[PDB]
């Protein structure tokens, strides 16, 4: 198996320096094949903190976060605040699976302590207002992938899919 890092994608951007391996190993499992994002992953029951992006366990089953499952290992200044799992690739909850998976993984989710000092009131946070999606490609796909503007002319496709595929629930607190 190989290590895998889960880059959450809310509207915020707190993902710059977190991983030891940015472009990954040979390839990520998430793809960009002119049909938008592929193999994007969903995580249910957790919410992300818009500041210090971290998946927090909030037992409500309506709460979900979609992100990118990349190749890498988080910078080794970490592993005290993350979750780490080996999953057989059938437990994954993917979206637009455009390939095959190693059938046993090593996933790295940015975890958080549930903050039992204030309650956890979540709120659905969609994605719109292009000025917020203009830089998603400039932050989490030109570093995560190299295909950005070497053969990509269909940027509008991944733009619209980011604008519609990725939604999530955030604690907003």
């Amino acid at each position: 198996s190989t290590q895998r890092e889960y880059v959450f994608i809310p509207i915020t951007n707190s993902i710059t320096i977190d991983v030891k391996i940015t472009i990954g190993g040979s390839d990520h499992i998430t793809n960009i094949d002119e049909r938008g994002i592929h193999n994007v992953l969903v995580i249910t029951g957790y919410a992300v903190d818009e500041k210090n992006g971290r998946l927090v366990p909030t037992l409500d089953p309506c709460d979900y976060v979609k992100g990118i499952l990349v190749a890498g290992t988080p910078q080794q200044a970490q592993s005290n605040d993350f979750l780490t799992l080996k999953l057989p690739a059938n437990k994954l909850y993917l979206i637009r699976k455009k390939g095959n998976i190693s059938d046993d993984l090593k996933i790295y989710i940015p975890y958080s302590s549930p903050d039992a000092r204030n309650s956890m009131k979540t709120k659905p946070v969609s994605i719109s207002d292009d000025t917020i999606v203009n830089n998603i490609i400039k932050e989490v796909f030109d570093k995560i992938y190299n295909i950005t503007q070497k053969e990509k002319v269909k940027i509008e496709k991944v733009k619209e899919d980011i604008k519609e595929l990725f939604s999530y629930y955030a604690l907003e607190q």
Partner: protein, 284 residues
């Protein structure tokens, strides 16, 4: 024959799960819509038929018409209560049907998801359906051969797909349930009641005062006695497919949509369910 007609209400209250409720109500409606006729000419009413009660009861002596028009509403409420308390649920045939069908589908190499759901609030399904529409003006989705109300498979699938496409995008939704140019990957069956607490059908009312009214000057209550489905009635239905992928979004969506509505009048909290149980039988 009219002999079958006059003797229908005792049939209702003395068969109670073995009379065809569809036909029974459809025939009761002929009595209901011809009330002042069945109440005349020294009818062949026995000393136990539920109709000579209105020869005794006198609601208005000044007018012969108003007496009948009041007895008619009394009789409508009485029929609602009759259906409600007599026609109860025997869910052994439904258990047999679902277990036999589950074996059938195992013999077809499907992955099955048996789902039991319980009614919390008085539910309505198929209000524009025809069962009591000739009496109450408001029907219930009924299956005249299983002789039980049900939740159409199309309705459950449509609600589930609206959710999935609300949260996963109308493109992953089409990947799961297909589009006008591809087939769906998930199949649903109707939900039949398997076990109730005490009742299956329960009466209710809806009295619009100011629906489509201009002012307080034409407001007037118009009560609508109809039939609903009791609370704590349990429905089960299967969800089968071949590629186990489509089993992931059916896992999570199902316990989330049932706590919202699943039938009519849900914006005033009526068709509310709860996932009593779920179970997958993988067959890859």
């Amino acid at each position: 024959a009219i002999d079958f007609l006059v003797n229908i209400l005792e049939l209702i209250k003395e068969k109670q799960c073995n009379i065809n409720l569809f036909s029974a109500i459809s025939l009761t409606s002929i009595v209901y819509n011809n009330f002042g006729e069945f109440l005349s000419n020294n009818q062949s009413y026995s000393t136990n038929n539920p109709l000579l009660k209105y020869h005794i009861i006198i609601l208005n002596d000044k007018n012969k018409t108003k007496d009948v028009e009041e007895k008619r509403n009394i009789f409508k409420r009485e029929v609602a209560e009759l259906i409600s308390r007599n026609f109860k649920l025997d869910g052994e045939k439904v258990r047999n049907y679902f277990d036999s069908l589950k074996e059938v589908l195992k013999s077809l190499k499907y992955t099955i998801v048996d789902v039991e759901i319980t009614t919390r609030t008085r539910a309505l399904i198929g209000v524009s359906t025809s069962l009591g529409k000739l009496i109450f003006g408001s029907g219930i989705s009924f299956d005249p051969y299983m002789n039980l109300p049900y939740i159409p498979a199309s309705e459950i699938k449509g609600i589930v797909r609206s959710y999935i496409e609300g949260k996963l995008g109308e493109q992953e939704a089409e990947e799961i349930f297909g589009n006008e140019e591809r087939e769906g990957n998930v199949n649903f069956t109707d939900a039949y009641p398997t076990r109730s607490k005490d009742f299956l059908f329960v009466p209710d009312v809806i009295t619009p005062h100011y629906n489509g009214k201009k002012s307080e000057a034409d407001a007037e209550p118009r009560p609508v006695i109809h039939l609903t489905i009791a609370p704590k009635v349990t429905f089960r239905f299967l969800i089968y497919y071949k590629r186990e992928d489509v089993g992931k979004p059916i896992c999570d969506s199902m316990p989330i949509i049932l706590i919202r509505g699943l039938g009519a009048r849900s914006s005033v909290g009526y068709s509310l369910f709860e996932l009593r149980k779920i179970e997958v039988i993988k067959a890859a």
